[PDB]
């Protein structure tokens, strides 16, 4: 499921290798701090593989969440 929208088609042309950019990268994380799978991100093998790295980088810098609390329920 979850075919409603994809993250790659949502935004424009952006650098995947830039870990300092929160606004772009936040879109690739889920409701929780988790990194969205391929079907959600719309990325490719290599792209996704790079995104993971730069996201983890940003996480170390305190820019991105490692995890979050889930609301609603």
């Amino acid at each position: 499921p979850s075919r409603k929208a994809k993250v790659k088609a949502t935004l424009g042309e952006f650098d995947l290798r830039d870990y300092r950019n929160v606004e772009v990268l936040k879109r690739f994380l889920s409701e929780t701090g988790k990194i969205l799978p391929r079907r959600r991100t719309g990325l490719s093998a290599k792209e996704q593989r790079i995104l993971a790295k730069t996201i983890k980088r940003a996480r170390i810098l305190g820019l991105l969440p490692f995890t979050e609390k889930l609301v609603r329920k």
Binding site: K69, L70, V71, R72, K73
Partner: protein, 119 residues
């Protein structure tokens, strides 16, 4: 002997029991309740009905302190989690927000054989 009137409700639900801690906005416990606080003893503590009784008991104990609105935090998977939520829904308390905080490791520690085939 406080008069808080706004606070937090922590539901901790395992398959063996359901225990509810109601606290002030800083997280310090005011009252608490469990399957065993109510008359139940054995496996019957892990029951949804028992969770309803626990939630209601904790809630009335809280309203005795003058509690009105709470923020609910849920930890653990088990029967009676959603029934505790459902009881707190209208206990007379107003549930503001519900949140699942259930703690999960990044694969730190080796689980017991019962919980294995994982890490």
């Amino acid at each position: 002997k406080r008069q808080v009137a706004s606070g937090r409700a922590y539901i901790h639900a395992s398959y063996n029991n359901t225990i509810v801690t109601i606290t002030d906005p800083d997280g310090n416990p005011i009252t608490w309740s469990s399957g065993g606080v109510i008359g139940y003893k054995g496996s019957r503590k892990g029951t949804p009905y028992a969770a309803q009784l626990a939630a209601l008991d904790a809630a009335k104990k809280a309203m005795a302190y003058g509690m009105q609105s709470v923020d609910v935090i849920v930890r653990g998977t088990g029967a009676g989690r959603e029934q505790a939520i459902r009881a707190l829904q209208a206990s007379g308390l107003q549930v503001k927000s519900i949140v699942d905080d259930t703690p999960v490791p990044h694969n730190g520690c080796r689980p017991k054989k019962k919980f294995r085939k994982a890490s």
